[PDB]
């Protein structure tokens, strides 16, 4: 009885000792786990700061991207506006380039036709002066013919003549008349008063019973 | 005895208590193991997050470079559009001024061609008219030529028989026995009618003494007795 | 027997000391368990924030990609336009000079044409005056002829005859023309009782039988 209780007391001494050993091993393991807790919480706080920093940069980046999107859209509308203006300018200037070239051709045509008309005016004036000069000469010839008519014409009746209009008349006193042939003749009183014609010749008419003509042409008496 | 039993009872309580302590130590080990399982889990999650964090900030650096380049590209593009826009304004000005001046030139050479065509016709029209007057002049010259020829052939210019031309005066010219009175009438010289020739009226006669001479029926001087 | 009781009492004390240490470990476990709960709340919240940042970043990547393409596209269009404007610059400044030269050329044409138009008027006026002065001269000649036609002899009246341009006296009995073209009397050669003494006509008489009395008649002596 005494020996049995004494042995269970020593067994208790050894079990207590062993339990303290086992207890100390668990306490060490708990101390390791607390070290891990502290390491985890440090990492947690460090990671939270990095999270804030990154999310901050990402939001700041997104502000710059939205500004860029907005600018691109604005640039897009400006380029949209410029292109048709340039289209229209191409159409306009290509038509002007043709129209200018045609104008240069038309101006050279005008110069040619003006130059030729200038020479034509000179040519024809010179020609018409030539015809006028020839005509003036002809007039001078007529004028010469008029002067010759003027200096050879008869305008004035002199001795024995009388002008009536454009007619001249011989004017005569006694002893002469004009016969039915318009000839100037002597008037011998119808040859009944001693003087007569023999042919064209004047004679004294004589009774040849009593008169003759002698060799002097005088009248004389016969027998 | 009674004191031996009190020791025995405490020794038994101590056996029970050591047993209790060992079961409590087993329960602490269970809880320690469960906690280590939670820590394990936590460490794995921290590892996922750390890796994702490194990936993200790396992705953000490359994105940053692309954005910076885009912003810089955009500025350059804005400068080219800003330069081009007033050039187009300027071209709108030149082409609209060229348009007006070209239309004006086109109407101008239209007018010129019309003016030049009228002047050509005028030159034709006047040369015709002038040739007209010259050819009419030639008509008049001929008409006057003909009138001069007609006058040339009909006029008296030359003194013929019994005549003499002094200047533009004509005179009858006479031999012996003829003269002209104050009136320019031609006359005969009858010797004052004192030598047997006389006038009675306009006619000539032999002036005769009628004691001795008479005219016979035949017109001859005869003797009366 | 007393030493047995003393070790029992020591064992009671040691058991009490071990239970005290056991409770201390239990406290630590409780604190640690609370840390674990707190750690899992904080982690869950941080994981959600990370997912949100990742989602934002991938959206941003795609938006940045689109912007880079649009930029390139815009650069193409600017690059298409710039040389077109350059060419239009050149061509319109050439056209500007060609237009100005055309304007100077059309101006010269107007000037020259206006002078030619005036030249035509000037020369027609000079030529018309020459023609008019020539009509006047013919007119002068015509009226001068007319006035000489009313005064000139053209027609033969009494004792005259016209042959061409020659006017002749014509004569019958008793008259003829001597070889000085003079009119003269035909007295039958003065053989027939009529003749001249000096300038005067006489009855030629044999003065052995006849004479002239005071009355000029022929009588017997
Ligand atoms: Cl961007
Ligand atoms: Cl004990
Ligand atoms: Cl003329």
XYZ file of C-alpha atoms and ligand atoms in Angstrom:
672
model
C 0.000 0.000 0.000
C 2.714 2.512 0.943
C 4.950 1.257 -1.845
C 2.158 1.441 -4.394
C 1.287 5.054 -3.598
C 4.963 6.063 -3.544
C 5.423 4.720 -7.086
C 2.371 6.511 -8.471
C 3.770 9.739 -6.978
C 7.074 9.306 -8.815
C 5.104 8.420 -11.959
C 3.276 11.707 -11.441
C 6.573 13.596 -11.097
C 7.676 12.222 -14.487
C 4.348 12.863 -16.204
C 4.246 16.434 -14.980
C 7.761 16.941 -16.316
C 6.787 15.469 -19.676
C 3.685 17.603 -19.882
C 5.812 20.719 -19.300
C 8.074 19.634 -22.143
C 5.090 19.070 -24.440
C 3.592 22.357 -23.232
C 6.827 24.223 -24.093
C 6.928 22.794 -27.623
C 3.383 24.056 -28.272
C 4.199 27.444 -26.788
C 7.141 27.707 -29.176
C 4.875 26.780 -32.063
C 2.453 29.486 -30.961
C 5.314 31.984 -30.827
C 6.214 31.079 -34.408
C 2.590 31.581 -35.469
C 2.568 35.040 -33.836
C 5.699 35.925 -35.769
C 3.837 34.923 -38.938
C 0.842 37.047 -37.893
C 3.141 40.097 -37.510
C 4.795 39.391 -40.867
C 1.396 39.048 -42.549
C 0.106 42.348 -41.135
C 3.216 44.235 -42.254
C 2.794 42.840 -45.752
C -0.906 43.812 -45.556
C -0.142 47.443 -44.774
C 2.654 47.598 -47.335
C 0.326 46.168 -49.975
C -2.425 48.635 -49.095
C -0.083 51.586 -49.706
C 0.965 50.148 -53.065
C -2.696 49.580 -53.957
C -3.507 53.231 -53.267
C -0.497 54.366 -55.310
C -1.302 52.172 -58.299
C -4.990 53.019 -58.334
C -3.997 56.691 -58.147
C -1.665 56.355 -61.165
C -4.289 54.408 -63.109
C -6.959 57.102 -62.542
C -4.419 59.792 -63.526
C -3.557 57.779 -66.633
C -7.255 57.536 -67.509
C -7.624 61.328 -67.309
C -4.852 61.648 -69.908
C -6.449 59.015 -72.146
C -9.823 60.764 -72.097
C -8.143 64.059 -72.990
C -6.465 62.265 -75.886
C -9.719 60.679 -77.089
C -11.368 64.081 -76.946
C -8.495 65.719 -78.873
C -8.499 63.020 -81.535
C -12.217 63.565 -82.071
C -11.648 67.323 -82.423
C -8.766 66.782 -84.859
C -11.010 64.404 -86.762
C -13.688 67.089 -87.272
C -11.119 69.653 -88.424
C -9.632 67.283 -90.985
C -13.183 66.428 -92.002
C -13.794 70.102 -92.647
C -10.560 70.707 -94.630
C -10.772 67.798 -97.117
C -13.866 68.951 -99.077
C -12.543 72.515 -99.186
C -9.398 71.137 -100.841
C -11.514 68.922 -103.106
C -13.414 72.011 -104.210
C -10.186 73.976 -104.807
C -8.840 71.196 -107.076
C -12.034 71.284 -109.161
C -12.021 75.064 -109.278
C -8.350 75.496 -110.209
C -8.290 72.789 -112.871
C -11.153 74.568 -114.639
C -9.354 77.925 -114.237
C -6.183 76.423 -115.739
C -8.055 75.356 -118.878
C -9.895 78.692 -119.035
C -6.614 80.633 -118.729
C -4.996 78.630 -121.533
C -7.938 79.189 -123.841
C -7.692 82.908 -123.075
C -4.011 82.953 -124.058
C -4.973 81.350 -127.388
C -7.769 83.844 -127.965
C -5.456 86.767 -127.189
C -2.920 85.545 -129.750
C -5.734 85.176 -132.280
C -6.809 88.779 -131.604
C -3.265 90.068 -132.042
C -2.944 88.296 -135.394
C -6.247 89.587 -136.704
C -5.481 93.098 -135.484
C -2.027 93.088 -137.133
C -3.468 91.951 -140.451
C -6.260 94.553 -140.297
C -3.673 97.306 -139.679
C -1.788 96.386 -142.865
C -5.028 96.093 -144.811
C -5.916 99.669 -143.851
C -2.510 100.913 -145.172
C -2.714 98.861 -148.379
C -6.199 100.083 -149.271
C -5.523 103.733 -148.428
C -2.431 103.652 -150.646
C -4.515 102.000 -153.386
C -7.277 104.575 -153.148
C -4.798 107.475 -153.198
C -3.414 106.039 -156.433
C -6.833 106.016 -158.058
C -7.482 109.555 -156.820
C -4.144 110.747 -158.196
C -4.858 109.193 -161.602
C -8.265 110.909 -161.602
C -6.791 114.295 -160.687
C -4.463 113.900 -163.682
C -7.402 113.123 -165.977
C -9.092 116.292 -164.649
C -5.973 118.296 -165.536
C -6.204 116.888 -169.063
C -9.854 117.920 -169.398
C -8.821 121.339 -168.084
C -6.176 121.636 -170.839
C -8.796 120.748 -173.450
C -11.092 123.418 -172.035
C -8.317 126.005 -172.319
C -7.698 125.122 -175.947
C -11.388 125.442 -176.663
C -11.349 128.824 -174.901
C -8.407 130.292 -176.848
C -9.448 129.049 -180.289
C -13.187 129.806 -180.086
C -14.854 132.639 -181.955
C -16.931 134.947 -179.772
C -16.870 138.301 -181.526
C -18.139 139.509 -184.905
C -15.724 141.908 -186.565
C -15.932 143.722 -189.882
C -18.830 142.636 -192.063
C -20.293 140.205 -189.526
C -22.932 140.188 -186.799
C -23.375 137.634 -184.019
C -26.813 136.390 -183.021
C -26.533 133.849 -180.227
C -24.249 131.135 -181.625
C -24.754 132.213 -185.258
C -22.731 134.604 -187.391
C -24.360 136.581 -190.214
C -22.607 138.504 -192.972
C -23.994 142.069 -192.894
C -24.225 144.012 -196.141
C -25.370 147.337 -197.603
C -26.732 148.214 -201.038
C -25.658 146.382 -204.173
C -25.492 142.964 -202.529
C -27.943 140.339 -201.317
C -28.082 136.666 -200.383
C -29.591 134.318 -202.939
C -31.664 131.230 -202.405
C -28.443 129.256 -201.789
C -27.522 131.632 -198.952
C -24.660 132.954 -201.077
C -23.454 136.531 -200.949
C -24.152 137.986 -204.463
C -24.252 141.361 -206.201
C -27.646 143.028 -206.680
C -27.928 144.135 -210.336
C -31.614 145.105 -210.001
C -32.723 141.959 -211.759
C -30.300 142.843 -214.651
C -32.858 145.150 -216.239
C -31.067 148.496 -215.737
C -27.916 148.209 -217.850
C -25.738 145.877 -215.725
C -25.888 142.089 -215.879
C -23.952 138.928 -215.181
C -22.285 136.787 -217.808
C -21.666 133.642 -215.848
C -20.357 134.914 -212.527
C -19.035 138.124 -214.124
C -20.507 141.614 -214.054
C -20.969 143.400 -217.411
C -22.654 146.477 -218.859
C -25.519 145.256 -221.003
C -25.382 146.878 -224.470
C -27.603 146.916 -227.533
C -25.216 145.501 -230.077
C -26.964 147.413 -232.851
C -25.366 150.579 -231.549
C -22.690 149.638 -229.012
C -19.735 147.319 -228.763
C -16.876 146.811 -226.336
C -13.540 147.970 -227.586
C -10.098 146.529 -226.932
C -9.791 148.662 -223.772
C -12.930 147.145 -222.277
C -14.793 150.434 -222.753
C -18.218 150.703 -224.308
C -18.024 152.286 -227.761
C -20.314 153.070 -230.733
C -20.534 150.960 -233.896
C -21.033 152.209 -237.491
C -4.673 5.491 7.987
C -7.260 8.258 7.810
C -4.179 10.319 6.931
C -3.008 7.673 4.421
C -6.413 7.867 2.701
C -6.202 11.647 2.306
C -2.838 11.281 0.520
C -4.181 8.493 -1.701
C -7.151 10.645 -2.664
C -4.903 13.562 -3.602
C -2.587 11.283 -5.599
C -5.639 10.117 -7.577
C -6.873 13.688 -8.138
C -3.350 14.442 -9.428
C -3.510 11.504 -11.896
C -6.875 12.779 -13.133
C -5.546 16.365 -13.417
C -2.436 15.354 -15.399
C -4.712 13.396 -17.716
C -6.855 16.518 -18.049
C -3.784 18.607 -18.830
C -2.664 16.244 -21.585
C -6.065 16.307 -23.242
C -6.031 20.080 -23.080
C -2.565 19.946 -24.676
C -4.018 17.781 -27.474
C -6.817 20.293 -28.006
C -4.291 23.120 -28.241
C -2.421 21.159 -30.905
C -5.638 20.717 -32.877
C -6.270 24.470 -32.737
C -2.616 25.196 -33.567
C -2.919 22.979 -36.635
C -6.157 24.607 -37.775
C -4.570 28.072 -37.410
C -1.482 27.008 -39.383
C -3.876 25.904 -42.083
C -5.393 29.409 -42.090
C -1.943 31.047 -42.258
C -0.964 28.735 -45.148
C -4.092 29.847 -47.019
C -3.316 33.485 -46.195
C 0.278 33.236 -47.437
C -0.890 31.754 -50.741
C -3.331 34.617 -51.233
C -0.678 37.202 -50.420
C 1.452 35.536 -53.102
C -1.259 35.793 -55.737
C -1.789 39.486 -54.915
C 1.946 40.346 -54.939
C 2.330 38.757 -58.358
C -0.776 40.463 -59.741
C 0.511 43.755 -58.300
C 3.829 43.390 -60.125
C 2.042 42.545 -63.351
C -0.253 45.554 -63.058
C 2.386 48.169 -62.342
C 4.429 46.774 -65.205
C 1.434 46.986 -67.528
C 0.872 50.548 -66.257
C 4.450 51.592 -67.136
C 4.089 50.394 -70.735
C 0.653 51.979 -71.063
C 2.183 55.193 -69.688
C 4.743 55.212 -72.533
C 2.030 54.676 -75.186
C -0.150 57.441 -73.753
C 2.823 59.850 -73.599
C 3.589 59.061 -77.253
C -0.043 59.506 -78.256
C -0.233 62.913 -76.503
C 2.936 64.012 -78.306
C 1.645 62.671 -81.658
C -1.618 64.531 -81.112
C 0.230 67.835 -80.581
C 2.180 67.373 -83.796
C -1.064 66.579 -85.638
C -2.688 69.698 -84.206
C 0.192 71.814 -85.497
C -0.127 70.488 -89.038
C -3.893 71.087 -89.111
C -3.370 74.595 -87.679
C -0.855 75.299 -90.465
C -3.051 73.888 -93.262
C -6.327 75.682 -92.416
C -5.164 79.290 -93.209
C -3.458 78.037 -96.365
C -6.847 76.820 -97.561
C -8.423 80.177 -96.579
C -5.739 81.841 -98.678
C -6.381 79.565 -101.637
C -10.129 80.300 -101.345
C -9.173 83.965 -101.652
C -6.868 83.518 -104.648
C -9.230 81.234 -106.594
C -12.245 83.419 -105.953
C -10.225 86.443 -107.097
C -8.933 84.466 -110.127
C -12.505 83.379 -110.926
C -13.781 86.971 -111.068
C -10.832 88.165 -113.139
C -11.084 85.233 -115.551
C -14.798 85.808 -116.186
C -13.927 89.455 -116.758
C -11.168 88.578 -119.221
C -13.527 86.216 -121.047
C -16.100 88.974 -121.486
C -13.325 91.408 -122.526
C -12.053 89.258 -125.368
C -15.675 88.690 -126.344
C -16.138 92.454 -126.658
C -12.829 92.749 -128.526
C -13.744 90.097 -131.070
C -17.060 91.842 -131.615
C -15.331 95.246 -131.906
C -12.652 93.873 -134.236
C -15.298 92.234 -136.464
C -17.244 95.520 -136.706
C -14.098 97.442 -137.621
C -13.259 94.934 -140.358
C -16.772 95.334 -141.764
C -16.516 99.120 -141.473
C -13.244 99.054 -143.424
C -14.952 96.924 -146.125
C -18.007 99.151 -146.139
C -15.973 102.367 -146.504
C -13.545 100.981 -149.142
C -16.587 99.949 -151.179
C -18.141 103.386 -150.763
C -14.858 105.107 -151.621
C -14.394 102.921 -154.698
C -18.007 103.847 -155.453
C -17.244 107.578 -155.484
C -14.114 107.066 -157.553
C -15.953 105.021 -160.170
C -18.689 107.650 -160.232
C -15.914 110.199 -160.696
C -14.708 108.218 -163.692
C -18.291 108.413 -164.997
C -18.282 112.212 -164.706
C -14.893 112.555 -166.362
C -16.186 110.643 -169.367
C -19.419 112.627 -169.541
C -17.355 115.840 -169.522
C -14.875 114.369 -171.993
C -17.805 113.650 -174.348
C -19.192 117.153 -173.882
C -15.761 118.552 -174.754
C -15.510 116.377 -177.846
C -18.956 117.524 -178.996
C -18.005 121.184 -178.474
C -14.602 120.534 -180.094
C -16.215 119.241 -183.287
C -19.051 121.777 -183.660
C -17.328 125.064 -182.795
C -15.899 127.465 -185.365
C -12.149 127.781 -184.828
C -10.781 128.477 -188.308
C -11.234 131.352 -190.784
C -12.053 130.075 -194.244
C -12.691 131.870 -197.535
C -13.084 135.613 -197.179
C -12.301 135.604 -193.466
C -9.545 136.312 -190.972
C -9.395 135.376 -187.289
C -7.908 137.867 -184.816
C -7.942 136.319 -181.370
C -11.586 135.431 -180.765
C -12.807 137.870 -183.427
C -13.620 137.043 -187.045
C -13.346 139.629 -189.816
C -14.357 139.471 -193.431
C -11.336 140.449 -195.567
C -11.936 142.234 -198.880
C -10.072 143.316 -202.011
C -10.353 146.498 -204.018
C -13.677 148.264 -204.257
C -15.092 147.156 -200.906
C -15.125 148.857 -197.514
C -17.042 148.762 -194.201
C -19.188 151.517 -192.695
C -19.387 152.581 -189.046
C -21.987 149.773 -188.313
C -19.398 147.187 -189.812
C -21.708 146.622 -192.852
C -19.917 145.667 -196.063
C -20.182 148.271 -198.844
C -19.206 148.767 -202.488
C -17.205 151.742 -203.750
C -19.187 153.129 -206.700
C -16.888 156.188 -207.198
C -19.398 158.442 -205.479
C -21.851 157.283 -208.165
C -20.166 159.869 -210.415
C -18.755 157.522 -213.113
C -21.867 155.880 -214.478
C -22.566 153.261 -211.800
C -25.269 153.948 -209.221
C -27.821 152.539 -206.816
C -31.552 152.795 -207.115
C -32.787 151.108 -203.961
C -30.456 148.285 -203.064
C -29.753 147.454 -206.728
C -27.056 148.702 -209.062
C -27.709 150.541 -212.352
C -25.909 152.233 -215.237
C -26.650 155.912 -214.726
C -27.752 157.236 -218.145
C -28.590 160.569 -219.781
C -32.198 160.082 -220.833
C -31.979 162.484 -223.737
C -29.887 159.800 -225.469
C -30.073 156.471 -223.629
C -32.803 154.080 -222.505
C -33.003 150.512 -221.289
C -34.494 148.150 -223.811
C -36.869 145.295 -222.989
C -33.849 142.958 -222.578
C -32.165 145.232 -220.015
C -29.510 146.708 -222.337
C -28.668 150.359 -222.807
C -29.846 151.319 -226.294
C -30.076 154.575 -228.224
C -33.382 156.453 -228.372
C -32.812 158.151 -231.778
C 5.683 8.814 4.759
C 5.968 12.538 5.454
C 8.312 12.972 2.482
C 5.659 11.325 0.309
C 3.090 13.947 1.321
C 5.613 16.715 0.606
C 6.105 15.538 -2.961
C 2.327 15.253 -3.401
C 2.009 18.878 -2.351
C 4.767 19.845 -4.815
C 2.931 17.929 -7.567
C -0.302 19.801 -6.760
C 1.645 23.080 -7.082
C 3.317 22.043 -10.339
C -0.008 20.904 -11.814
C -1.497 24.287 -10.880
C 1.509 26.049 -12.514
C 1.107 23.993 -15.668
C -2.600 24.779 -15.869
C -1.760 28.457 -15.491
C 0.686 28.216 -18.437
C -1.929 26.275 -20.410
C -4.429 29.108 -19.972
C -1.816 31.605 -21.111
C -1.400 29.644 -24.329
C -5.193 29.616 -24.641
C -5.248 33.427 -24.382
C -2.617 33.656 -27.104
C -4.648 31.347 -29.314
C -7.683 33.577 -28.818
C -5.777 36.753 -29.742
C -4.270 34.967 -32.771
C -7.681 33.720 -33.884
C -8.997 37.277 -33.792
C -6.035 38.475 -35.874
C -6.837 35.777 -38.431
C -10.479 36.942 -38.732
C -9.330 40.549 -39.118
C -6.670 39.536 -41.640
C -9.275 37.744 -43.801
C -11.620 40.776 -43.795
C -8.836 43.144 -44.820
C -7.662 40.699 -47.525
C -11.081 40.170 -49.060
C -11.497 43.940 -49.299
C -8.036 44.367 -50.883
C -8.632 41.571 -53.364
C -11.819 43.301 -54.547
C -9.889 46.567 -55.044
C -7.238 44.739 -57.069
C -9.870 43.188 -59.355
C -11.287 46.678 -59.887
C -7.854 48.060 -60.774
C -7.118 45.178 -63.160
C -10.465 45.652 -64.902
C -9.766 49.378 -65.262
C -6.294 48.771 -66.629
C -7.447 46.330 -69.314
C -10.146 48.773 -70.460
C -7.460 51.492 -70.597
C -5.175 49.258 -72.697
C -7.897 48.844 -75.307
C -8.716 52.564 -75.323
C -5.039 53.454 -75.716
C -4.765 50.951 -78.616
C -7.711 52.594 -80.373
C -6.214 56.054 -79.912
C -2.920 54.943 -81.415
C -4.773 53.695 -84.515
C -6.929 56.828 -84.879
C -3.819 59.008 -84.609
C -2.159 57.027 -87.389
C -5.312 57.312 -89.455
C -5.414 61.075 -88.868
C -1.760 61.388 -89.822
C -2.517 59.644 -93.129
C -5.263 62.142 -93.975
C -3.107 65.124 -93.028
C -0.352 63.619 -95.152
C -2.761 63.265 -98.053
C -3.854 66.911 -97.797
C -0.559 68.769 -97.266
C 0.935 68.008 -100.751
C -2.397 68.809 -102.345
C -2.342 72.252 -100.717
C 1.316 72.674 -101.761
C 0.461 71.909 -105.366
C -2.510 74.280 -105.282
C -0.205 76.973 -103.822
C 2.168 76.643 -106.785
C -0.516 76.391 -109.431
C -2.574 79.338 -108.236
C 0.473 81.619 -108.012
C 1.340 80.682 -111.642
C -2.282 81.352 -112.650
C -2.092 84.706 -110.817
C 0.754 85.854 -113.084
C -0.771 84.442 -116.270
C -3.999 86.249 -115.446
C -2.183 89.555 -114.852
C -0.252 89.200 -118.113
C -3.521 88.455 -119.900
C -4.978 91.659 -118.469
C -2.019 93.730 -119.695
C -2.295 92.029 -123.102
C -6.041 92.700 -123.417
C -5.379 96.309 -122.360
C -2.836 96.737 -125.153
C -5.304 95.277 -127.663
C -7.977 97.757 -126.609
C -5.471 100.641 -126.939
C -4.199 99.602 -130.367
C -7.734 98.909 -131.619
C -8.903 102.323 -130.452
C -6.040 103.947 -132.342
C -6.817 101.865 -135.444
C -10.473 102.866 -135.220
C -9.411 106.526 -135.131
C -6.935 105.962 -137.995
C -9.698 104.564 -140.172
C -11.853 107.678 -139.542
C -8.909 110.018 -140.221
C -7.979 108.413 -143.521
C -11.536 108.110 -144.783
C -11.978 111.813 -143.990
C -8.811 112.734 -145.880
C -9.820 110.573 -148.884
C -13.397 111.935 -148.912
C -11.976 115.470 -148.959
C -9.751 114.640 -151.935
C -12.757 113.133 -153.755
C -14.922 116.136 -152.843
C -12.294 118.589 -154.053
C -12.182 116.613 -157.322
C -15.971 116.724 -157.778
C -15.718 120.458 -157.226
C -13.054 120.767 -159.950
C -15.156 118.850 -162.477
C -18.025 121.068 -161.384
C -15.859 124.121 -162.099
C -14.897 122.827 -165.543
C -18.515 122.011 -166.395
C -19.835 125.443 -165.545
C -16.877 127.037 -167.358
C -17.723 125.033 -170.461
C -21.386 126.049 -170.180
C -20.494 129.756 -170.135
C -18.251 129.361 -173.153
C -21.048 127.476 -174.969
C -23.404 130.437 -174.704
C -20.816 132.824 -176.214
C -19.050 130.906 -178.981
C -19.965 130.885 -182.650
C -21.062 127.448 -183.872
C -23.596 128.088 -186.697
C -23.416 129.661 -190.181
C -25.909 132.404 -190.885
C -26.274 134.526 -194.035
C -23.442 134.403 -196.572
C -21.612 131.745 -194.537
C -21.157 128.008 -194.533
C -19.567 125.772 -191.934
C -17.268 122.908 -192.915
C -16.050 121.111 -189.790
C -14.349 123.790 -187.664
C -13.924 126.163 -190.617
C -16.293 129.030 -191.426
C -16.434 130.130 -195.060
C -18.050 133.015 -196.840
C -20.040 131.625 -199.759
C -20.653 133.754 -202.836
C -22.676 133.812 -206.001
C -22.601 136.007 -209.098
C -20.348 139.036 -209.069
C -18.053 137.913 -206.254
C -15.194 135.503 -205.714
C -12.032 135.180 -203.590
C -8.619 136.342 -204.806
C -5.481 134.374 -203.989
C -4.995 136.350 -200.755
C -8.255 134.762 -199.543
C -9.899 138.198 -199.907
C -13.472 138.688 -201.059
C -13.540 140.458 -204.412
C -15.621 141.478 -207.399
C -15.757 139.605 -210.693
C -15.877 142.399 -213.279
C -15.457 140.045 -216.286
C -11.793 140.998 -216.417
C -12.812 144.664 -216.970
C -13.248 143.827 -220.609
C -17.031 144.397 -220.630
C -17.740 148.007 -219.760
C -17.408 147.747 -215.939
C -14.139 148.336 -214.200
C -12.220 150.025 -211.399
C -10.416 153.335 -211.387
C -8.434 153.252 -208.204
C -10.801 151.921 -205.571
C -14.008 152.923 -207.345
C -16.253 151.138 -209.794
C -16.761 152.964 -213.109
C -18.595 152.425 -216.374
C -15.686 152.217 -218.784
C -16.369 154.539 -221.742
C -14.815 155.393 -225.090
C -14.242 159.090 -224.455
C -14.428 159.818 -228.194
C -18.196 159.373 -227.900
C -19.199 159.465 -224.224
C -18.586 161.431 -221.069
C -19.951 161.690 -217.548
C -22.111 164.727 -216.791
C -22.380 166.488 -213.407
C -25.222 164.120 -212.313
C -22.671 161.277 -212.922
C -24.651 159.768 -215.808
C -23.277 158.595 -219.153
C -23.929 161.015 -221.998
C -22.862 161.766 -225.554
C -20.065 164.334 -225.983
Cl -4.151 57.713 -75.562
Cl 1.093 12.968 -6.683
Cl -11.839 112.131 -158.298
